Design a protein around this ligand. Structure first.
Ligand SMILES: Nc1nc2c(ncn2[C@@H]2O[C@H](COP(=O)(O)OP(=O)(O)OP(=O)(O)O)[C@@H](O)[C@H]2O)c(=O)[nH]1
Ligand SMILES: [Mg+2]
Length: 167
């Protein structure tokens, strides 16, 4: 009765894939990392009374040239696509990533959500809320903005991808 989830987090370099994950897992914010290394965390959380066993695959940076597999993994229960509100490139890239992710997964019922991270960097935003939101809507995906400095926003990200898979 203790549910299980493997979640993959995707996106361009330095968008905050690791920071969000670490903030959600260890409750702290970090200034540096090992960019091209894949990392996997385990985290237990109770969402609405139900206990979930979480595996979080913090993938290495990908761009428009990264190879996406042609076939999905059964054991992966959902995908978080991250970009930074401070980087146009990361936004262009997350669209390419969604594209290649959709080729890989086909019609299979595995949730994909979109996260615009670094919302706390007000003076460096180059992507509006409406643009991320409308992109997500065009994908029939969920959308949140987040800051890896703000624990509750990282919580809301993972909670939402879990809830999508229950839908
Ligand atoms: N202010 C602010 N800085 C952030 C936020 N998220 C990440 N950063 C910073 O952005 C830089 C990149 O963060 P990472 O978590 O390493 O990004 P990443 O997606 O894991 O990048 P790769 O591992 O290279 O793929 C780091 O210096 C972080 O401290 C955020 O939400 N707000
Ligand atoms: Mg990473």
């Amino acid at each position: 009765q203790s549910k299980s989830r493997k979640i993959a987090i995707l996106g361009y370099r330095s968008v905050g894939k690791s920071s969000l994950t670490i903030q959600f897992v260890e409750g702290q914010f970090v200034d540096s990392y090992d960019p091209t290394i894949e990392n996997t965390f385990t985290k237990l959380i109770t969402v609405n009374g139900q206990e979930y066993h979480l595996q979080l695959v913090d993938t290495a940076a990908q761009d428009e040239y990264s190879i996406f597999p042609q076939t999905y993994s059964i054991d992966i229960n959902g995908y978080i696509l991250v970009y930074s509100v401070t980087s146009i490139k990361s936004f262009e890239v997350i669209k390419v990533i969604h594209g290649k992710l959709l080729d890989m997964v086909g019609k299979v019922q595995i949730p994909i959500m979109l996260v615009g991270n670094k919302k706390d960097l007000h003076m460096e935003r180059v992507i509006s809320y409406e643009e991320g939101k409308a992109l997500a809507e065009s994908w029939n995906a969920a959308f949140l903005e987040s800051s890896a400095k703000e624990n509750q926003t990282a919580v809301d990200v993972f909670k939402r991808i879990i809830l999508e898979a229950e839908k």
